[PDB]
């Protein structure tokens, strides 16, 4: 897993890979590691996938209630505090490394949340197995007050560096741009690698497989 985020001049850009590995076999491709917490707050997740999914969903629901009651868009600090307090209560047994990104009345905020309840507000963050390579790219090429296209290019480069160099990561790249004005969620922004053409067709003709028994049960379409 590589997830990464950066703050550009008028918002945030979040990026992640789309590979899920159970052991050392790629259990899934085109997995979505960018989650919805609120209209203005999206969060990437890494670590235990179920923990990331469920904690992000729970905080999404709590912030939905909070925003409904207060009548104003949710703040990023509220999401950060909810997440960190839950994670601290569970003492790291729920395993989630999260890049929390959203824009609110204060401005653009990017937070990085560790499994034990630590949080860090930063201009740029990375998490997962490829965090070191992504951080290498960020440390090299991040500059303050970047434009949106520049930030997208940087995050794509970092997630790509994580993809190629790290084994656990690798698939299409996803991007998400949150601005004060708009949100653009970009399932595959880039497709760095593709499966090669199958030279030989092995399509099994009918009758290739023997069958001891069969039972056809008609369904009453209606």
């Amino acid at each position: 897993t590589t997830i990464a985020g950066v703050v550009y001049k008028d918002g945030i850009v979040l990026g992640a890979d789309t590979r899920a590995t159970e052991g050392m076999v790629v259990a899934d491709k085109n997995c979505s590691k960018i989650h919805f917490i609120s209209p203005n707050i999206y969060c990437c997740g890494a670590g235990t996938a179920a923990d990331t999914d469920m904690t992000t969903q729970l905080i999404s629901s709590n912030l939905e209630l909070h925003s409904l009651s207060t009548g104003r868009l949710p703040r990023v600090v509220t999401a950060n505090r909810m997440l960190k307090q839950m994670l601290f209560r569970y003492q790291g047994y729920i395993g989630a490394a999260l890049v929390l990104g959203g824009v609110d009345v204060t401005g653009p905020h990017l937070y990085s949340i560790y499994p034990h309840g630590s949080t860090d507000k930063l201009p740029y963050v990375t998490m997962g197995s490829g965090s070191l390579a992504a951080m290498a790219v960020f440390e090299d090429k991040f500059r303050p007050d970047m434009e949106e296209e520049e930030a997208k290019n940087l995050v794509s480069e970092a997630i790509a560096a994580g993809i190629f160099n790290d084994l656990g990561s690798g698939s299409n790249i996803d991007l998400c741009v949150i601005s004060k004005n708009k949100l653009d969620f970009l399932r595959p922004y880039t497709v760095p690698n593709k499966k090669g053409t199958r030279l030989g067709r092995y399509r099994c003709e009918k009758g290739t497989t023997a069958v001891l028994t069969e039972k056809i049960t008609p369904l009453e379409i209606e």
Binding site: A49, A50, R198, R203, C204, K206, V211, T213, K215, I216
Partner: protein, 204 residues
């Protein structure tokens, strides 16, 4: 691992206006088969099926608990569950026991109640849902059957071609593992019918 104690294999595949779900039949305690008729695929609807591989006890237990929840859902809401909603329910059930997990790796395969768009997904030990457009696999022989699926599968397959592909993949995969085999059953779900066939396989 504890998952390897009983052993199993479950597979699902997506064609065109059809799904196939297939699983082995062996039930054995670490090496000694007991029965060649274990039910690892259970019906969760008219054209929605679940497939459980892992510990036999947790297979049966999560199947029964899910049927409890699903029957109450169908009675309360007066409609058949959508496949994605069954996925979410199963994920909630498994994550409820995030500590002391049910040792299963479920697979859901079915058609949408109205669109009849095909749906396949898999869940991990602790309820991580993964939806795929090509195939999903679970059990001891995930590695072998993953490779076999990645080779054989093709998009927009006919029902007959889907049956041939899933049959070949399960048979050749379970041939190369010790703890699964003793026959395989293939369920084919189409909008108009369910076709269940038991293949001829090596009983070794």
């Amino acid at each position: 691992s504890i998952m390897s104690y009983n052993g199993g294999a479950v597979m699902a595949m997506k064609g065109k206006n059809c799904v196939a779900i297939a699983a082995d039949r062996r039930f054995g305690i670490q090496a000694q088969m007991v029965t060649t008729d274990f039910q690892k695929i259970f019906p969760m609807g008219d054209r929605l099926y679940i497939g459980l591989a892992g510990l036999a006890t947790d297979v049966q237990t999560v199947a029964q608990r899910l049927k409890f929840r699903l029957n109450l859902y169908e009675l309360k809401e007066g409609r058949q569950i959508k496949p994605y909603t069954l996925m979410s329910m199963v994920a909630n059930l498994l994550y409820e026991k995030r500590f002391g997990p049910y040792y299963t790796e479920p697979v859901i395969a079915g058609l949408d109640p109205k669109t009849f768009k095909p749906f396949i997904c898999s869940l991990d030990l602790i309820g991580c849902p993964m939806v795929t457009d090509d195939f999903v696999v679970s059990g001891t022989c995930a590695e072998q059957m993953y490779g076999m699926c990645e080779s054989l599968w093709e998009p927009n397959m006919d029902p007959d071609h889907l049956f041939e592909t899933i049959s070949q993949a399960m048979l050749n995969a379970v041939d190369r593992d010790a703890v699964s085999g003793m026959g395989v059953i293939v369920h084919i779900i189409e909008k108009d019918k369910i076709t269940t066939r038991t293949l001829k396989a090596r009983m070794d």
